Specification:
Shape: globular
Structural class: alpha+beta
Radius of gyration: 20 Å
CATH architecture of the largest domain: Sandwich
CATH topology of the largest domain: Tumour Suppressor Smad4
Bound molecules: the ligand OC[C@H]1C[C@@H](O)CCN1CCc1ccc(Nc2nc(-c3ccc(Cl)c(Cl)c3)cs2)cc1
């Protein structure tokens, strides 16, 4: 990528590490693959161990951020999700979210690191090599602003997303592949092959606001947020979507994905059509009708990012600034930056260049 900022030399960083991540070898990996590189780059660090849910969220929320030049997060998409939400929960959120962030991959669920590795111009590497590369980026100190997804649930919960909101097949596999945690990145492949054999479809309603249809006018009364940025494009979930949105006629899906970056994983190049503009995200969905065969061919084609070449008539892609997803019947299972979330309805909008990350 091209840098829009740079960390000072020397600099001190807070390393937030999950010792349970990377099959319980994250600390070992930091010492061998990260620490010696930081010493040569004149980067001071202090390690904080976080192995409980909301723990790093609690820390970042209470932390004196002035001490640090950057916060490096070493676990995966889950922990970066925690840190960012921790920052956004703060009363001083607007300056707090400007604290540069760094993603260092540990084990599985490292799509954000994979994407940054790609922007930098590196080959699609995994595990040891990815960690080295992501550290090399941090050592080269270059910064870039990143889009942020604001989400609202049917219970009124307001959360943020750095990477993705999945629903259907993808979200189901995310959850069910947890009992294959020890297998590494390949658990998504095995989970996919299993769910493919026992294939199911998902009834629900999708609406989105595409880039070209954002006018000068905003809905009269939007969602009133307690704290944080105002989501101007969104209306309350009890209200129907504004008339300029595209309501998807189809209501039978195999998957729906809102994605802010290039990769869904270290070996899943989901978005080869190019990096999103400021305040825009990718939106994919697959309609019921695809065969098990084609679904698999798409999944395997993702490795080298060649899935869009099939021109499958059940796969639709649109760049959007906002979306609403209302699963039919009961509550739906969602993946938010890898993490499980269950809700009756979810909607969100994109906030442009809202936080900074180290990148190439
Ligand atoms: O929740 C999304 C990400 C979050 C990360 O932190 C962890 C990994 N997770 C995605 C994992 C995953 C990715 C893909 C699948 N399965 C399949 N995905 C596809 C597929 C086909 C076409 C497209 Cl355009 C896409 Cl995006 C997916 C077909 S089968 C199952 C699991």
């Amino acid at each position: 990528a091209m840098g829009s900022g740079v960390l000072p030399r020397p600099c001190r960083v807070l390393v937030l590490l999950n010792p349970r991540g990377g099959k319980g070898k994250a600390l070992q990996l930091f010492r061998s693959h990260v620490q010696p590189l930081l010493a040569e780059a004149e980067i001071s660090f202090t390690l904080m161990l976080t192995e409980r849910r909301n723990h790093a969220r609690e820390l970042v929320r209470s932390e004196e951020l002035g001490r640090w030049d950057a916060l490096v997060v070493m676990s995966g998409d889950g922990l970066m999700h925690e840190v960012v939400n921790g920052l956004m929960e703060r009363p001083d959120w607007e300056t707090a979210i400007q604290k540069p962030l760094c993603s260092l991959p540990a084990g599985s669920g490292n799509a954000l690191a994979a994407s940054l590795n790609h922007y930098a111009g590196y080959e699609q590497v995994t595990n040891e090599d990815l960690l080295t590369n992501c550290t090399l980026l941090l050592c080269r100190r270059l910064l870039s602003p990143m889009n942020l997804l604001s989400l609202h649930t049917a219970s009124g919960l307001r959360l943020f997303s750095v990477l993705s909101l999945a629903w259907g097949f993808i979200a189901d596999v995310d959850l069910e592949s947890e009992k294959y945690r020890r297998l590494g990145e390949m658990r998504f492949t095995l989970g996919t092959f299993l769910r493919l054999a026992a294939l199911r479809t998902y009834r629900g309603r999708l609406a989105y606001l595409p880039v070209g249809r954002v006018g000068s006018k905003t809905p009269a009364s939007p969602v009133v947020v307690q704290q944080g940025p105002v989501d101007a494009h969104l209306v309350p979930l009890e209200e129907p979507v504004p008339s300029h949105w595209t309501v998807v006629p189809d209501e039978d899906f195999v998957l729906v994905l809102a994605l802010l970056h290039s990769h869904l994983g270290s070996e899943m190049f989901a978005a080869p059509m190019g990096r999103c503009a400021a305040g825009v995200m990718h939106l994919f969905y697959v309609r019921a009708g695809v065969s098990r065969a084609m679904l698999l061919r798409l999944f395997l084609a993702m490795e080298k990012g060649r899935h869009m070449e099939y021109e499958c008539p059940y796969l639709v892609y649109v760049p959007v600034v906002a979306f609403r997803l209302e699963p039919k019947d009961g509550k739906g299972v969602f993946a938010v930056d890898g993490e499980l979330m269950v809700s009756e309805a979810v909607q969100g909008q994109v906030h442009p260049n809202y936080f900074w990350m180290v990148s190439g």
